[PDB]
Symmetry: C2
Subunit: 132 residues, 2 copies
Amino acid sequence: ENSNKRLLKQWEKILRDNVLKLLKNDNNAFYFKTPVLEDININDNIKEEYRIKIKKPMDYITISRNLSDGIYKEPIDFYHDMKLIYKNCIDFNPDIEENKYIIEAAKSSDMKFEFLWNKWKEKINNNFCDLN
Amino acid sequence: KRLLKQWEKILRDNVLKLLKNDNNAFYFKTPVLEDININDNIKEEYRIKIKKPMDYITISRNLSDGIYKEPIDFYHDMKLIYKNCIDFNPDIEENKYIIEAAKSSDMKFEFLWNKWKEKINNNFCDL
């Protein structure tokens, strides 16, 4: 919520505006916006199951916060976290009719993210100095 | 029933199948000009403006009947559905869901095309 005066690096700006911005508010974003373990809409029994089973829970708001705070040391650390959101959904939720929308939303967003990462990886690598 | 070519089966089962029944497929399933939910005023303007209307059921029929001679013809028609949606619908708050659904599915299709293209080109005889 607090205003961040920290100046984002050019590679961090590309991930924020050209990759994350187009995914964080799309038609398949709804279930991946806020964290699972602190969401009031999910019952306590599923939240207990998620905390015990999921190694690292990930969502769009955590990524927006990490990108703002300068948590990622390399652009690939953002890639791994974005991929983690969709990978956690497929691994936790069983492939059944009641989970049809959520499994499709995770699969489609992963494909959409991979396109956006492939389209921008050239400029991302060019704006990132690994030697400094 | 006509026996489909191996490359046609790859486009049907590995590309089209994952797109025709997704969360953004709704508006791109059946043709605009024959859809009962759309009013005649939008329909006539679509007939005048849009050069070639395209949808998932038209592509499913074209792939099964053997309309496409090359796999790139399926690619051009698949892109056309999302292209016609952006060109006709103005960038307004009312058309927010539809414009996003065309953009996201275009990105999804491009992923599935690039993923399978190596197997698609191999299963197609050029000469």
